[PDB]
Amino acid sequence: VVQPINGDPFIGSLETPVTSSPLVAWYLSNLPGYRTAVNPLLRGIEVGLAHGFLLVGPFVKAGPLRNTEIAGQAGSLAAGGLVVILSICLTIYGISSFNEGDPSTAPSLTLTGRKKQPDQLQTADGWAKFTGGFFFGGISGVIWAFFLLYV
Amino acid sequence: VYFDLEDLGNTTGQWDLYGSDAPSPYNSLQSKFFETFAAPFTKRGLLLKFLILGGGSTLAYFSATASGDILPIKKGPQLPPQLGPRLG
């Protein structure tokens, strides 16, 4: 029901039906961010696609032009503008966190305790390719929502 | 026994919670598209030059040409202005 995390009662966490249940562990291990052995560039493209597509909604429908005819275009530009600024945050996060030679700071073990290769997302180039996918994905996802809503 | 000097990674619980090393489940030709079209944005040093300058120029263009139909601040005052309190 409520067990110590991985049987260790002195790690600072619990294993509950929310943290680790068969359906929870499946959906979380299927998100592009937990695909530890797949290309980080293609992760970010799916991430940017999903987010830029989501950002078009609130900007257009709540912006200062929400009740005008210039609504869909402005909130979409505001949506892409939010993707541009977020891509700078993702970039400077990598420039500060990861160096050009450091290995992945990702866990090299599994839930059962065997040695695998760490998620290269947590490296300088692996981050540089992830944020590059987010930017390309976020711009096209903004456009895709802008395509379906006002075209 | 959750303590081991030869495996300090398990003693401290350095486990990947939901990381799945399953291979890429994507359209592999779409991958060749995403890997070659989103490629120039994958240098963080150049991307920072791009986002900083591209956004700065784009923000400048949109604000420089913003019509009065959009910005009250560029449309300007329309009413005649009222005097000051002491015939100012």
């Binding site: 600024i85 700078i88 500060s96 | 900083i52 956004g55 700065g56 400048a60 604000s63 420089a64």
Partner: peptide
């Protein structure tokens, strides 16, 4: 208006973003 529409977004959006990004990298460097 032809110049305020240029400098107000530059000093209030671009410069602070460029400054905040610059200082974030200097303070985090080792």
């Amino acid at each position: 208006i032809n110049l305020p529409s240029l400098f107000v977004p530059l000093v209030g959006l671009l410069f602070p973003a460029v400054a905040m990004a610059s200082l974030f990298l200097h303070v985090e460097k080792r």
